[PDB]
Design a protein around this ligand. Structure first.
Ligand code: HDD
Ligand code: HDD
Ligand code: CA
Ligand code: CA
Ligand code: CA
Ligand code: CA
Ligand code: CA
Ligand code: CA
Lengths: 678, 678, 357
């Protein structure tokens, strides 16, 4: 690890300058006790110069994000399908670093914005660093990389006033979506729960593009990368996400950091779909088109290995802020395809690191370094940290005996372009007609959602498009939505007081695909790390005893228990003042605390009605809620929460209460609490 | 015409060109065949993507989140009797300005409504050079020596292992620093008051913080404090409102300012000074060099120098607001520095830090930084040099350029000059003046000057933040410092966190008060123009829409911003219930034709369960004027648990009588009787 | 290493301090700032050549190019969450740097020059008086060279005004080259004082001749010339001189061709007398007259020169070099030749070969 060598311990010692001279840094040097500061105060200037220069440009996209270290372990020797060294043996372990992100927001924007999310993975392999720079949505908005600045200018804030932050809910974004119909598939995913995932751990990763697996014999197959969550799939609801953005902008980064610290590091199966080169145009679309998925019914997933994140960074800036991913970080055994989106990405990620790092030696930062020797004739540049011993860095040479030697298909385990690849035809700036169906797959996706998930997606579009001020953009939006689904256009039009266009059935169909629905993906496979708020009181000795019994029972099963009361003490984690329903996956009231839920309840220690609002918000957002103790009746009445409700619990016995409540936590959301269009 | 019209680029017509004027396209990559790989010879692709890849610059090291506008400063008099400053030398003399407002801790995407200190930075483009006053909305600063700035800022910014939490002092490190560095107490009390969560940039004041000098053409000097006094009045959010608003509208302050300017409600401030003699530096019971102290207005009254009005929004946010580079080193003849060790070190920081932001030394050439008078100097070259200098002899002294440019000084060329009565005497020391040692009296002065509900809000802010501090040593240390300002504050805060306050230490306790620091105490707002009224209506009753239309006409006559809310958009409805929130309004009105939407059984797929009532309830609980217009008020007020006889609760059949009452409620702004007191 | 080394007078250690020299004072600012230009970022002290050889303990963080992974997640002072580390270093603890505690300041805040700085001419005259006569001539001749290339007549006149304040004789001798009259003597700062240690010509023979360069001019024509050169090489290399044998073409024992050779390549030049024919009144292998020109240039520039082997008149007469000149050597004995020649290398320059005013 080039990180180990660069760790700096300041647990002991006297303060020094950056050149090791012991100094102080608390008072400026002045001409007299009430005098002006001296230019000769080098202690002042070195410290303030460093401060003045701490910042670097944020990433042009995915500025908001968080990372962790872990390991990838291969399940098999995959030599039969790829030459890739990190996949060449059962049990072979490769260190990883992953960064998760949103896309549009700046640094400091909220984790729980509605957005596409990044899932970028570095494998520090024994044949070089290999990055899979993916997203949580398997399809992209655009079909050619040259359009990326158009997409991103349109979804980022309007450039006269820089409003709005971290949101596509503005005219320019919906203008672009409605004028560039390729956007429909990713737009449908972003308007689904996939736009507001419950955590980084509860979302999948996708390479998006078709890539190639290349064997040592030169043969190739076409692949798609899928990183399948072992925590299950889960979403927030929009109203909840909006509050959580305010209450805790750091929710996803905190969730990941806490899961790793608690020994619950998240896991994914790293999978591929594998298909023959001859199938590029066999599935009714082009595998070069990054707006399309291969339905799992046409190509099943093969599990290649386990990705586990299990160690947080030491210094966020040095590791997470400075990690510089590139799809150009490729290894022998993998190749590109002629996807015009992927093709232009390769240029962008090498160039942009010059902006971020301010100079060309960014691969020398410890987080970017490889775990194998570097042998090349790259030299000099600002921030050069190496002292090269070869004073003949040119090829061909005799004065360094021909080293470094060329690597290729037959030498030094070189990367090689898949030798079956060809190109033929005119040099054109033309789109393939095979890319022209922008609407069938958006429909496939929409069909594959549950009825309440379809409603959530319609309601997300109703929310955003109602904030578009241009009547002509809103009309154009309905024109494009109508090509995917007349019913979606009609339901969205109803919220904005416009008429939908007449049905246009060209791309309408009834087909569905497995594995894209969140609500449909069944109970969560584990409830470890899920958050339980216990609403108690210091008023009643019994209320703190009830809380402490629930705590033992719930903590047994790996739940993160927060006991909330008016004030802190032994056994109480948080005050009502700091508590919010967005902080919990389920909420339990101990019946000992009933008096806090009365309409007349008031305290200077928390805002009017806070205890009941927590319970009501949790219920209205679909969470498991209940009252534990015996007068379960009374609290449920104040909340207008029906005792016979799905995901509403009411037990005198703590043992019975928890057994029922933990099933609700796995169900995770009670969708019968949301109204559907007729 | 904008003051920067010479630099404007119009793209309302024309064909796409490269940056060198070659007509091009930018929508499809050049490929070897229609399904081929992209070509390196595609310069169209690479120039567009290189530009995109390099769009970002480092955010400001502090004050990264902010927003700006153009306007005019107008002098009320000829101030040559106190200052040589040209921009102040005649009655009615006009100078263009640019102002940026900001928070301090958050990154450039963080919420406007975080609790924080705020920036108020003003550039005067004077006829004798650019003059900047780089101020805050709080008149005192945390620390007494610039060399400590990185300590303060590291402690309040996110913890550097995981970069949590964003835009908040509510974590261990910050309260560790506050409790170990007692100078922080005065600013801390201001930040924990409503001055930490201002209602808008227009509803806060600006302060230079430091003592400066005014210097006459005869060389005599006076000591001054700058105060920019809002002509809009002072107003705050409540914390539990600010937290939701951070999620519902991270852009609230920048939108409020932008909208005020577009509506012809450009905000205004009286630019004022306190003026005292050089002999009064240590006359008021503290040192005028100490930036943790105010001069109570009872000791030195404000003199109004002129009017600051902001009335023009930027054309390009990045080019004007993101790129504006303020400096206290931007000083003009007639002003001088003081030996305040905080101001002293700032002068270094703001010249250096622009190298980080701009990437090169020619940042004063950016349009927003250029002066409006000629530049004559021997500065040359550097990256990004825009000027073509004719003078081939840029050294002094010269004969080959006839001795030009000529030296400017007190006696020639209207030169800047150091106040000539200034001296220094004594040892060259890294020592703090004992005159700086009282860190507690003025925090007590401030606390004493707040109303009772205001004192409660400040206690509650401290209770909120300190309850989130994990360390029991840090919480005890915080109570030790707060106890030196006020035993009552320490006891009340300690009650929320389950510790005992230490015994009273009355060394610094006193009962003195000072005018002009209280928000609650500053009486009704002088204008209600721009304040926001939400009218909750329904499409289900044509008569509810008629009530809303009649209310709109009458409220808009008085310059209120009216939003009619209903289930769906149509003519006369601005916003759906789905996108509406009480944080969007300064007052809420329900038309009694919509009373059915407030029923417990009310449900719609078009908005979250209970949304209409929650808007009314939140508005009431946050202290806003609320009412029901039309005569049938019982169903709504009873559903909301709001008493018809409450102060700032309105029930009238007559639209005219409703609006007359409700408008007095908007001027009152907050009904503080709805908040519990210890 | 060399291009990236970033020196600073702000790189100071306990036991050294600054003075109020206004030139030094402003340097402290410049050298910290300028490394931002060179490095493009604030972490230039992390470059290997700039790193210290002792631990770094401070709360500097982040910046482009940050190489460290800091473990201390509480980088502020004062702190309890990192137990108050790093600790402040000062005069009394941790071997801190400290400003000399006797230093004071007193007076107005001024942009004024100390009148104690105003004598700009006495020390130039002290320096000039301390040079030997030939060295004064060299200095006059450097000023005559440079000032003759100044196009402005008024600049040239202003230069003579200032030079005249140091020395009227300098002004007169410079003026003679540029066709101007010197201004009348102004004796305010004239004096006859001298100081030791500033003269090069007067600093006596070099204390070592190791590394000094001896060019041996030979020929491939005459196998005996190559034999003479080989014998001379052996004798000179024994004493640590760097020997170059020059001939028309390369072969074993010949280092350079006459085409690439120049008198500026040598501190001393020896012709072996077997090569005397090359010193007469042409070849496609080198420019016309090259062998003789190397000898003549070496002589004109003051170097020790000579002929080894016993026959010197043909070479020295072709060169217009007198056999009895100081720093001109002729011996048949290689040992004798080298003993005499080495004394000449230590003398280094024979300054009797330069004309004086
Ligand atoms: C032509 C430009 C372009 C295009 C078409 C894309 N991107 Fe990209 N992307 C960039 C240009 C870029 C960039 C400007 O080069 C960034 C900013 C920071 C960086 O390292 O690269 C970036 C960053 C970035 C990151 C953040 C990595 C990190 O955490 O540091 C992720 C996850 C993605 N992108 C993912 C994608 C996916 C899955 C794409 C489509 C399949 C995609 N991008 C298309
Ligand atoms: C020694 C360093 C230091 C100290 C003691 C302070 N600041 Fe500062 N401040 C900076 C170093 C700095 C900076 C790093 O130089 C920034 C970042 C961006 C910039 O141009 O300057 C800055 C930015 C900055 C801005 C943003 C200007 C804009 O909108 O672009 C404001 C309003 C202030 N500061 C105000 C203050 C006030 C009122 C202070 C105390 C009275 C103060 N700062 C002390
Ligand atoms: Ca827009
Ligand atoms: Ca969902
Ligand atoms: Ca740079
Ligand atoms: Ca190849
Ligand atoms: Ca902390
Ligand atoms: Ca307040």
């Amino acid at each position: 690890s080039p990180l180990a060598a660069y760790e700096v311990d300041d647990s002991t010692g006297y303060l020094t300058s950056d050149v090791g001279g012991p100094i102080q840094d608390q008072t400026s040097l002045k001409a007299g006790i009430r005098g002006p500061t001296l230019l000769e105060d080098f202690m002042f200037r070195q410290k303030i110069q460093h401060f003045d220069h701490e910042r670097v440009p944020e990433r042009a996209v995915h500025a908001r994000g968080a990372g962790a270290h872990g390991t990838f372990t291969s399940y098999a020797d995959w030599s039969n399908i790829t030459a890739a060294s990190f996949l060449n043996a059962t049990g072979k372990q490769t260190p990883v670093f992953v960064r998760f992100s949103t896309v549009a927001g700046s640094r400091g924007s909220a984790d729980t914005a509605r957005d596409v999310h990044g899932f970028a993975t570095r494998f520090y392999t024994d044949e070089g660093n290999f990055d899979i720079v993916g997203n949580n949505i398997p399809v992209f908005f655009i079909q050619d990389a040259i359009q990326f600045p158009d997409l991103i200018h349109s979804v980022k804030p309007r450039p006269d006033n820089e409003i709005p932050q971290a949101a596509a809910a503005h005219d320019s974004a919906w203008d672009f979506f409605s004028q560039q119909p390729s956007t429909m598939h990713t737009l449908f995913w972003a308007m689904s729960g996939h736009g507001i995932p419950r955590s980084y751990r509860h979302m999948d990763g996708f390479g998006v593009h078709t890539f190639r697996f290349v064997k040592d014999d030169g043969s190739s197959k076409l692949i798609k990368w899928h990183f399948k969550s072992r925590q299950g799939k889960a979403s927030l609801v929009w109203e909840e996400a909006q509050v959580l953005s305010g209450k805790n902008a750091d929710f996803h980064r905190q969730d990941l950091w806490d899961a790793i610290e608690s020994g619950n590091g998240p896991e994914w199966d790293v999978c591929v779909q594998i298909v023959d080169e001859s199938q590029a145009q066999a599935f009714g679309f082009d595998l070069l088109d990054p707006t399309k998925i291969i339905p799992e019914e046409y190509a099943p997933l093969t599990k290649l290995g386990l990705l586990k994140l299990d160690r947080n960074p030491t210094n966020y800036f040095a590791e997470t802020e400075q990690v510089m991913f590139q799809p150009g970080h490729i290894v022998r055994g993998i190749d590109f395809t002629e996807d015009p989106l992927l093709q232009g990405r390769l240029f962008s990620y090498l160039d942009t690191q010059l902006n971020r790092n301010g100079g060309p030696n960014f691969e020398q930062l410890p987080i970017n370094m490889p775990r194998v020797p570097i042998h090349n004739n790259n030299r000099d540049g600002a921030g050069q940290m190496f002292i090269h011993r070869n004073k003949y860095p040119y090829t061909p040479n005799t004065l360094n005996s021909g080293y470094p030697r060329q690597a290729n298909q037959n030498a030094g385990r070189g990367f090689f372009t898949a030798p079956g690849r060809t190109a033929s035809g005119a040099l054109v700036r033309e789109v393939s007609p095979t890319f022209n169906d922008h609407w069938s797959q958006p429909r496939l996706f929409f069909n594959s959602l549950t009825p309440v998930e379809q409603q959530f997606l319609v309601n997300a579009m109703r929310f955003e498009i109602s904030l578009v001020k241009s009547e002509e953009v809103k009309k154009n939006v309905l024109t494009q939505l109508n090509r995917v689904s007349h019913d979606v256009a009609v339901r969205v039009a109803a919220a904005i007081g416009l008429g939908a266009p007449d049905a246009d059935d060209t791309y309408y169909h009834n087909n569905k695909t497995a594995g894209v629905s969140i609500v449909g993906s069944g109970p969560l496979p584990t409830i470890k790390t899920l958050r339980v708020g216990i609403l108690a009181t210091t008023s009643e000795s019994s209320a703190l005893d009830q809380a402490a019994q629930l705590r033992t029972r719930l903590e047994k099963d790996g739940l993160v228990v927060t006991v909330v009361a008016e004030t802190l003490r032994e056994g109480v984690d948080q005050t009502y003042s700091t508590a919010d329903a967005t902080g919990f996956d389920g909420v339990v009231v101990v019946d000992g605390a009933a008096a806090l839920f009365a309409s007349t309840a008031s305290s200077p220690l928390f805002p009017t009605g806070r205890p009941l609002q927590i319970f009501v918000d949790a219920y209205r957002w679909g969470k498991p809620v209940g009252v534990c103790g015996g007068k379960s009746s009374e609290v449920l009445d104040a909340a207008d929460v029906p005792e016979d409700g799905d995901g509403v619990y009411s037990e005198e016995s703590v043992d019975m209460f928890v057994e029922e409540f933990e099933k609700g936590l796995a169900t995770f959301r009670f969708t019968d609490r949301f109204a559907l269009d007729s």
